[PDB]
Design a protein around this ligand. Structure first.
Ligand SMILES: [Ca+2]
Ligand SMILES: [Zn+2]
Length: 123
């Protein structure tokens, strides 16, 4: 599933301000991270990132590729490739709590300025 800017904004409205993070900033971050695609899979060296939030099997979810993973979100990585982003959001919040917004390189690089374009009026 590939969401549009406003569709996703509506789904994450209740997350505004979570961990001091503003909604438009999070939308911008996700645009440059996965392009709003729930099925994005990106192989890094000996690890892989999954889904809309690009959650890593190196530390956050369990995958057969990295059997030694701490699996902090306590969930198999396949759950981040389906149509329900509810469990993806639960894990992203745990990343925000523990590690913070810098888990996503896009935030500091491109998402602290030129923010009006990320606002949504109605879809
Ligand atoms: Ca999911
Ligand atoms: Zn990444």
């Amino acid at each position: 599933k590939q969401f549009t800017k406003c569709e996703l904004s509506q789904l994450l409205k209740d997350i505004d301000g979570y961990g001091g993070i503003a909604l438009p900033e999070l939308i911008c971050t996700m645009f440059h991270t996965s392009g709003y695609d729930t099925q994005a899979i990106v192989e890094n060296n000996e690890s892989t990132e999954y889904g809309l939030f690009q959650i890593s099997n190196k530390l956050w979810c369990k995958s057969s590729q990295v059997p030694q993973s701490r699996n902090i979100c306590d969930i198999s990585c396949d759950k981040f490739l389906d149509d329900d982003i509810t469990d993806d959001i639960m894990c992203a919040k745990k990343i925000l709590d523990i590690k913070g917004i810098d888990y996503w390189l896009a935030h500091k690089a491109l998402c602290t300025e030129k923010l009006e374009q990320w606002l949504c009026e109605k879809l």
